Amino acid sequence: GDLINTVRGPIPVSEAGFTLTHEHICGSSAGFLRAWPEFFGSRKALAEKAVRGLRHARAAGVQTIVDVSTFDIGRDVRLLAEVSRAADVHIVAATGLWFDPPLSMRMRSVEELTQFFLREIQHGIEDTGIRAGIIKVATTGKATPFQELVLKAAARASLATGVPVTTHTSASQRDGEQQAAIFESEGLSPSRVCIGHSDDTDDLSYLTGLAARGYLVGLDRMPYSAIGLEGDASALALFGTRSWQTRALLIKALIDRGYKDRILVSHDWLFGFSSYVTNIMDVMDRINPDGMAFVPLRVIPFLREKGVPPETLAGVTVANPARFLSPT
Ligand SMILES: CCOP(=O)(OCC)Oc1ccc(OC)cc1
Ligand SMILES: [Co+2]
Ligand SMILES: [Fe+2]
């Protein structure tokens, strides 16, 4: 009955199945894939890599990914539709703004940003008719003045459409608390919101405080670890020095504290990555050759072997994303 928009059109919520709620086909910048496709070898090479990766995920049981690339992450919805079709994996596209908005966005009011998010949800992205099914926002510490506007615009767009909001945080700085305060100031329900990158911290006081208020807690960087690459400063800064098992333990922790229905799990993976240092994709591909199959192949069995019931693991990977993505 309930439906969600994907880059291939509407699908029943019940067909979303096992869903990775924070992912990227390509982490880039607005206009960049059009201006400089050779950065990625070629657009064709990038697509082929993405198709191989999504087929691998699919083989491991993933049926849907939420590509949370916004305009300023250089989201290319035609690319998403091409790879979704070829790999037979659903892709939900995003509106919103990450932390690299250009001046044409940064100069905008809350009202104007709301119109833009609404356009991408209700009308379509660019000239494609593909509708966003999620709204992505970001802070990296205390919100900038502009980021405050973005979070308010995200709340308003969500209220008008029922589409959920998902966030990038600096989890070590506990951004989720201010994000929550801003969302609530606009009257947005916490159940419409996922506070992302929350597995970047082991601060369970912070995480359970959010979960208790009804927020979804995005444990979405599972394979991120620069353990063994301490010589690579850019890898250390991005990936951290905590193991995937450490990250995965937070899923169990929240389940053990009663919060199984408030957890979303993902990788924050990608198949191309131009917004960071050159060759970062090769480093990442070495850290996690499994890509977006890492959660089903490593994390879910790890949790099972720690005694998490199959029903609970299905609730986390199927029921929670379905409830979150269903327009409400
Ligand atoms: C690794 C994925 O997370 P990120 O927010 O990218 C979204 C596509 O990563 C960053 C990208 C650029 C940065 O510049 C300082 C920092 C993080
Ligand atoms: Co992010
Ligand atoms: Fe991301």
GROMACS .gro file of C-alpha atoms and ligand atoms in nm:
model
  347
    1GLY     CA    1   0.000   0.000   0.000
    2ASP     CA    2   0.260   0.257   0.115
    3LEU     CA    3   0.512   0.356  -0.153
    4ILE     CA    4   0.861   0.506  -0.175
    5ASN     CA    5   1.017   0.690  -0.470
    6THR     CA    6   1.325   0.541  -0.624
    7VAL     CA    7   1.534   0.653  -0.922
    8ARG     CA    8   1.339   0.393  -1.132
    9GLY     CA    9   1.001   0.523  -1.005
   10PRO     CA   10   0.760   0.426  -0.724
   11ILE     CA   11   0.799   0.094  -0.539
   12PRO     CA   12   0.590  -0.064  -0.260
   13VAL     CA   13   0.761  -0.006   0.080
   14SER     CA   14   0.733  -0.386   0.137
   15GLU     CA   15   0.964  -0.445  -0.159
   16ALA     CA   16   1.247  -0.235  -0.022
   17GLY     CA   17   1.363  -0.540   0.178
   18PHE     CA   18   1.716  -0.537   0.323
   19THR     CA   19   1.806  -0.165   0.288
   20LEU     CA   20   2.137   0.020   0.341
   21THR     CA   21   2.018   0.365   0.450
   22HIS     CA   22   2.335   0.572   0.408
   23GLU     CA   23   2.532   0.508   0.090
   24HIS     CA   24   2.674   0.679  -0.220
   25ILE     CA   25   2.728   0.577  -0.580
   26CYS     CA   26   2.977   0.862  -0.609
   27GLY     CA   27   3.098   1.124  -0.358
   28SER     CA   28   3.169   1.431  -0.571
   29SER     CA   29   3.063   1.794  -0.620
   30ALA     CA   30   2.778   1.962  -0.816
   31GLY     CA   31   2.871   1.969  -1.191
   32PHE     CA   32   3.196   1.776  -1.145
   33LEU     CA   33   3.110   1.441  -1.310
   34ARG     CA   34   2.980   1.641  -1.614
   35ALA     CA   35   3.290   1.872  -1.629
   36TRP     CA   36   3.567   1.619  -1.554
   37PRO     CA   37   3.447   1.255  -1.596
   38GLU     CA   38   3.811   1.151  -1.664
   39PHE     CA   39   3.883   1.213  -1.300
   40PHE     CA   40   3.705   0.873  -1.249
   41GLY     CA   41   3.874   0.716  -1.557
   42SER     CA   42   3.543   0.773  -1.734
   43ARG     CA   43   3.175   0.794  -1.662
   44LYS     CA   44   3.145   0.443  -1.822
   45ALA     CA   45   3.421   0.305  -1.590
   46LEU     CA   46   3.252   0.462  -1.289
   47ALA     CA   47   2.911   0.316  -1.384
   48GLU     CA   48   3.061  -0.033  -1.447
   49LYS     CA   49   3.236  -0.028  -1.109
   50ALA     CA   50   2.912   0.080  -0.938
   51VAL     CA   51   2.712  -0.193  -1.117
   52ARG     CA   52   2.970  -0.463  -1.008
   53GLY     CA   53   2.960  -0.332  -0.650
   54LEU     CA   54   2.580  -0.319  -0.634
   55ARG     CA   55   2.551  -0.671  -0.787
   56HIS     CA   56   2.790  -0.792  -0.515
   57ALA     CA   57   2.571  -0.629  -0.249
   58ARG     CA   58   2.264  -0.778  -0.415
   59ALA     CA   59   2.419  -1.127  -0.414
   60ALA     CA   60   2.479  -1.077  -0.034
   61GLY     CA   61   2.107  -0.993   0.015
   62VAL     CA   62   2.091  -0.610  -0.019
   63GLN     CA   63   1.781  -0.512  -0.214
   64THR     CA   64   1.779  -0.128  -0.169
   65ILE     CA   65   2.027   0.146  -0.099
   66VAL     CA   66   1.951   0.505  -0.001
   67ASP     CA   67   2.201   0.720  -0.195
   68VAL     CA   68   2.220   1.023   0.040
   69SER     CA   69   2.424   1.229  -0.215
   70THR     CA   70   2.276   1.582  -0.225
   71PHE     CA   71   2.317   1.846  -0.491
   72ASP     CA   72   2.655   1.950  -0.336
   73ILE     CA   73   2.778   1.588  -0.320
   74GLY     CA   74   2.740   1.605  -0.702
   75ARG     CA   75   2.446   1.360  -0.704
   76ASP     CA   76   2.383   1.255  -1.066
   77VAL     CA   77   2.036   1.099  -1.070
   78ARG     CA   78   2.078   0.973  -1.429
   79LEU     CA   79   2.387   0.782  -1.317
   80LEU     CA   80   2.187   0.637  -1.020
   81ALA     CA   81   1.903   0.528  -1.250
   82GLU     CA   82   2.148   0.364  -1.496
   83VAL     CA   83   2.329   0.163  -1.227
   84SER     CA   84   2.005   0.076  -1.037
   85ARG     CA   85   1.864  -0.067  -1.363
   86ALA     CA   86   2.178  -0.262  -1.451
   87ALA     CA   87   2.235  -0.406  -1.102
   88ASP     CA   88   1.867  -0.459  -1.019
   89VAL     CA   89   1.902  -0.287  -0.683
   90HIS     CA   90   1.662  -0.009  -0.583
   91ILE     CA   91   1.816   0.331  -0.520
   92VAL     CA   92   1.638   0.603  -0.322
   93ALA     CA   93   1.774   0.952  -0.413
   94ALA     CA   94   1.813   1.246  -0.174
   95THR     CA   95   1.753   1.618  -0.163
   96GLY     CA   96   1.896   1.854   0.107
   97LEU     CA   97   2.246   1.996   0.136
   98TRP     CA   98   2.570   1.849   0.278
   99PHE     CA   99   2.855   2.073   0.405
  100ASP     CA  100   2.989   2.194   0.068
  101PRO     CA  101   2.704   2.419  -0.060
  102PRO     CA  102   2.813   2.672  -0.330
  103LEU     CA  103   2.734   3.042  -0.293
  104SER     CA  104   2.406   3.008  -0.492
  105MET     CA  105   2.279   2.787  -0.208
  106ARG     CA  106   2.457   2.965   0.083
  107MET     CA  107   2.290   3.297  -0.004
  108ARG     CA  108   1.940   3.143   0.026
  109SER     CA  109   1.677   3.196   0.300
  110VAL     CA  110   1.497   2.918   0.487
  111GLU     CA  111   1.190   2.979   0.266
  112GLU     CA  112   1.395   2.953  -0.054
  113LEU     CA  113   1.577   2.632   0.064
  114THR     CA  114   1.237   2.479   0.153
  115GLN     CA  115   1.118   2.549  -0.205
  116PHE     CA  116   1.429   2.384  -0.346
  117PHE     CA  117   1.393   2.065  -0.127
  118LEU     CA  118   1.018   2.055  -0.214
  119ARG     CA  119   1.102   2.081  -0.587
  120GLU     CA  120   1.328   1.775  -0.567
  121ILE     CA  121   1.072   1.574  -0.365
  122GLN     CA  122   0.747   1.680  -0.535
  123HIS     CA  123   0.842   1.781  -0.893
  124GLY     CA  124   1.161   1.591  -0.968
  125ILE     CA  125   1.538   1.636  -0.966
  126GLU     CA  126   1.667   1.862  -1.250
  127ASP     CA  127   1.464   1.781  -1.563
  128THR     CA  128   1.435   1.406  -1.494
  129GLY     CA  129   1.107   1.362  -1.303
  130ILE     CA  130   1.296   1.140  -1.051
  131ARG     CA  131   1.176   1.229  -0.705
  132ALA     CA  132   1.386   1.243  -0.389
  133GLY     CA  133   1.276   1.001  -0.111
  134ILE     CA  134   1.488   1.141   0.172
  135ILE     CA  135   1.627   1.477   0.281
  136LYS     CA  136   2.010   1.486   0.375
  137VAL     CA  137   2.155   1.765   0.601
  138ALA     CA  138   2.493   1.808   0.767
  139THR     CA  139   2.688   1.979   1.043
  140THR     CA  140   3.056   1.929   1.138
  141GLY     CA  141   3.038   2.064   1.496
  142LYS     CA  142   2.815   2.352   1.595
  143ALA     CA  143   2.581   2.443   1.302
  144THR     CA  144   2.692   2.738   1.092
  145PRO     CA  145   2.424   3.008   1.050
  146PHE     CA  146   2.353   2.867   0.703
  147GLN     CA  147   2.335   2.509   0.834
  148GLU     CA  148   2.071   2.625   1.086
  149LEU     CA  149   1.861   2.736   0.787
  150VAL     CA  150   1.922   2.411   0.606
  151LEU     CA  151   1.804   2.202   0.906
  152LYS     CA  152   1.489   2.421   0.939
  153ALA     CA  153   1.417   2.395   0.565
  154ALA     CA  154   1.468   2.014   0.590
  155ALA     CA  155   1.212   2.001   0.879
  156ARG     CA  156   0.959   2.204   0.682
  157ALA     CA  157   1.001   1.999   0.364
  158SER     CA  158   0.967   1.678   0.570
  159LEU     CA  159   0.650   1.810   0.742
  160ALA     CA  160   0.496   1.895   0.402
  161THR     CA  161   0.585   1.562   0.229
  162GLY     CA  162   0.633   1.299   0.511
  163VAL     CA  163   0.979   1.215   0.363
  164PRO     CA  164   1.236   1.150   0.637
  165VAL     CA  165   1.546   1.357   0.721
  166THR     CA  166   1.894   1.203   0.763
  167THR     CA  167   2.207   1.373   0.889
  168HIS     CA  168   2.584   1.388   0.874
  169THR     CA  169   2.738   1.470   1.211
  170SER     CA  170   3.071   1.511   1.372
  171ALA     CA  171   2.966   1.240   1.624
  172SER     CA  172   3.266   1.307   1.857
  173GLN     CA  173   3.129   1.665   1.899
  174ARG     CA  174   2.777   1.532   1.971
  175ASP     CA  175   2.614   1.736   1.688
  176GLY     CA  176   2.295   1.525   1.709
  177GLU     CA  177   2.185   1.717   2.021
  178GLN     CA  178   2.177   2.056   1.844
  179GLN     CA  179   2.033   1.898   1.529
  180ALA     CA  180   1.750   1.744   1.739
  181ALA     CA  181   1.689   2.083   1.909
  182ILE     CA  182   1.662   2.262   1.572
  183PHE     CA  183   1.433   1.995   1.423
  184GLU     CA  184   1.209   1.997   1.730
  185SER     CA  185   1.193   2.379   1.721
  186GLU     CA  186   1.019   2.330   1.381
  187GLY     CA  187   0.788   2.062   1.517
  188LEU     CA  188   0.941   1.769   1.332
  189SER     CA  189   0.882   1.424   1.485
  190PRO     CA  190   1.210   1.254   1.600
  191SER     CA  191   1.085   0.933   1.427
  192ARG     CA  192   1.127   1.115   1.096
  193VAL     CA  193   1.495   1.177   1.167
  194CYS     CA  194   1.813   0.971   1.156
  195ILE     CA  195   2.119   1.118   1.326
  196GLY     CA  196   2.399   0.979   1.106
  197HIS     CA  197   2.764   0.879   1.155
  198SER     CA  198   2.665   0.791   1.511
  199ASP     CA  199   2.898   0.486   1.503
  200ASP     CA  200   3.191   0.736   1.484
  201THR     CA  201   3.160   0.766   1.866
  202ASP     CA  202   3.136   0.513   2.152
  203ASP     CA  203   2.949   0.769   2.361
  204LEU     CA  204   2.639   0.561   2.451
  205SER     CA  205   2.510   0.843   2.681
  206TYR     CA  206   2.486   1.059   2.370
  207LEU     CA  207   2.342   0.777   2.154
  208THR     CA  208   2.090   0.645   2.403
  209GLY     CA  209   1.979   1.004   2.486
  210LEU     CA  210   1.883   1.046   2.117
  211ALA     CA  211   1.727   0.696   2.087
  212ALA     CA  212   1.519   0.759   2.406
  213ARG     CA  213   1.372   1.073   2.239
  214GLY     CA  214   1.267   0.860   1.938
  215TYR     CA  215   1.545   0.951   1.690
  216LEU     CA  216   1.683   0.686   1.458
  217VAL     CA  217   2.050   0.631   1.527
  218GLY     CA  218   2.254   0.589   1.206
  219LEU     CA  219   2.540   0.339   1.261
  220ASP     CA  220   2.641   0.392   0.904
  221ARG     CA  221   3.020   0.379   0.876
  222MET     CA  222   3.067   0.006   0.956
  223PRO     CA  223   3.377  -0.073   0.744
  224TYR     CA  224   3.557   0.259   0.826
  225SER     CA  225   3.898   0.191   0.989
  226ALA     CA  226   4.250   0.330   0.929
  227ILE     CA  227   4.398   0.068   1.164
  228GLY     CA  228   4.725  -0.032   0.995
  229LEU     CA  229   4.743   0.293   0.790
  230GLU     CA  230   4.865   0.518   1.066
  231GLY     CA  231   5.121   0.659   0.818
  232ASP     CA  232   4.837   0.799   0.601
  233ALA     CA  233   4.714   1.119   0.769
  234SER     CA  234   4.416   1.165   0.534
  235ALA     CA  235   4.298   0.805   0.594
  236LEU     CA  236   4.336   0.846   0.971
  237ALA     CA  237   4.133   1.167   0.970
  238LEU     CA  238   3.846   1.019   0.763
  239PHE     CA  239   3.831   0.656   0.881
  240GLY     CA  240   3.939   0.677   1.245
  241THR     CA  241   4.138   0.421   1.451
  242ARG     CA  242   3.847   0.205   1.577
  243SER     CA  243   3.785  -0.138   1.426
  244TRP     CA  244   3.468  -0.245   1.242
  245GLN     CA  245   3.400  -0.485   1.529
  246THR     CA  246   3.408  -0.186   1.768
  247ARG     CA  247   3.156  -0.012   1.544
  248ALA     CA  248   2.942  -0.327   1.512
  249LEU     CA  249   2.936  -0.367   1.892
  250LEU     CA  250   2.730  -0.042   1.912
  251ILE     CA  251   2.449  -0.213   1.721
  252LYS     CA  252   2.443  -0.487   1.987
  253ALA     CA  253   2.477  -0.222   2.263
  254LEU     CA  254   2.171  -0.034   2.151
  255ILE     CA  255   1.975  -0.360   2.102
  256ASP     CA  256   2.080  -0.470   2.457
  257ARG     CA  257   1.948  -0.139   2.592
  258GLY     CA  258   1.603  -0.175   2.433
  259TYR     CA  259   1.662   0.033   2.122
  260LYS     CA  260   1.645  -0.229   1.845
  261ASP     CA  261   1.370  -0.031   1.661
  262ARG     CA  262   1.583   0.289   1.661
  263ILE     CA  263   1.889   0.162   1.474
  264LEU     CA  264   1.978   0.198   1.107
  265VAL     CA  265   2.294   0.029   0.972
  266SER     CA  266   2.500   0.116   0.660
  267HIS     CA  267   2.855   0.166   0.526
  268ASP     CA  268   2.871   0.521   0.384
  269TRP     CA  269   3.042   0.347   0.096
  270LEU     CA  270   3.097   0.476  -0.263
  271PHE     CA  271   3.235   0.368  -0.600
  272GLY     CA  272   3.397   0.703  -0.684
  273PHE     CA  273   3.517   0.978  -0.455
  274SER     CA  274   3.646   1.312  -0.592
  275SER     CA  275   3.569   1.534  -0.286
  276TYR     CA  276   3.867   1.398  -0.093
  277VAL     CA  277   4.236   1.320  -0.160
  278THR     CA  278   4.339   1.168  -0.490
  279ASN     CA  279   4.345   0.784  -0.488
  280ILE     CA  280   4.128   0.765  -0.171
  281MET     CA  281   3.903   0.513  -0.352
  282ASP     CA  282   4.198   0.270  -0.391
  283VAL     CA  283   4.281   0.298  -0.019
  284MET     CA  284   3.910   0.230   0.064
  285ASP     CA  285   3.885  -0.062  -0.178
  286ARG     CA  286   4.181  -0.220   0.004
  287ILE     CA  287   4.029  -0.160   0.354
  288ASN     CA  288   3.697  -0.313   0.235
  289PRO     CA  289   3.704  -0.512  -0.094
  290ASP     CA  290   3.346  -0.625  -0.013
  291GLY     CA  291   3.211  -0.267  -0.051
  292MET     CA  292   2.836  -0.256   0.018
  293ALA     CA  293   2.822  -0.633   0.085
  294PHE     CA  294   3.034  -0.583   0.399
  295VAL     CA  295   2.733  -0.539   0.633
  296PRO     CA  296   2.553  -0.859   0.527
  297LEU     CA  297   2.874  -1.063   0.492
  298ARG     CA  298   3.061  -0.953   0.810
  299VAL     CA  299   2.849  -0.741   1.038
  300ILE     CA  300   2.526  -0.940   1.046
  301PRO     CA  301   2.706  -1.280   1.114
  302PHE     CA  302   2.925  -1.113   1.378
  303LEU     CA  303   2.604  -0.996   1.552
  304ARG     CA  304   2.441  -1.337   1.512
  305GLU     CA  305   2.746  -1.507   1.670
  306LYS     CA  306   2.720  -1.260   1.962
  307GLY     CA  307   2.366  -1.393   2.012
  308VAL     CA  308   2.148  -1.133   1.841
  309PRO     CA  309   1.831  -1.321   1.728
  310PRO     CA  310   1.764  -1.344   1.348
  311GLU     CA  311   1.428  -1.171   1.402
  312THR     CA  312   1.600  -0.876   1.565
  313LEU     CA  313   1.856  -0.852   1.282
  314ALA     CA  314   1.571  -0.860   1.024
  315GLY     CA  315   1.388  -0.590   1.227
  316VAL     CA  316   1.703  -0.368   1.205
  317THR     CA  317   1.783  -0.422   0.832
  318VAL     CA  318   1.426  -0.446   0.690
  319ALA     CA  319   1.159  -0.321   0.929
  320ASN     CA  320   1.342  -0.008   1.053
  321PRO     CA  321   1.437   0.124   0.702
  322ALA     CA  322   1.075   0.053   0.582
  323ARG     CA  323   0.924   0.250   0.872
  324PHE     CA  324   1.178   0.527   0.823
  325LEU     CA  325   1.140   0.564   0.443
  326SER     CA  326   0.757   0.528   0.432
  327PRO     CA  327   0.621   0.884   0.395
  328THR     CA  328   0.456   0.961   0.725
  329LIG     C1  329   3.377   0.936   0.332
  329LIG     C2  330   3.233   0.973   0.314
  329LIG     O1  331   3.200   1.081   0.401
  329LIG     P1  332   3.208   1.231   0.347
  329LIG     O2  333   3.110   1.322   0.441
  329LIG     O3  334   3.173   1.233   0.192
  329LIG     C3  335   3.039   1.236   0.143
  329LIG     C4  336   3.042   1.192  -0.001
  329LIG     O4  337   3.369   1.256   0.346
  329LIG     C5  338   3.435   1.376   0.335
  329LIG     C6  339   3.447   1.440   0.212
  329LIG     C7  340   3.520   1.558   0.204
  329LIG     C8  341   3.581   1.612   0.317
  329LIG     O5  342   3.651   1.731   0.306
  329LIG     C9  343   3.716   1.797   0.414
  329LIG    C10  344   3.570   1.546   0.440
  329LIG    C11  345   3.496   1.428   0.448
  330CO      CO  346   2.849   1.207   0.587
  331FE      FE  347   2.779   0.989   0.336
   0.00000   0.00000   0.00000
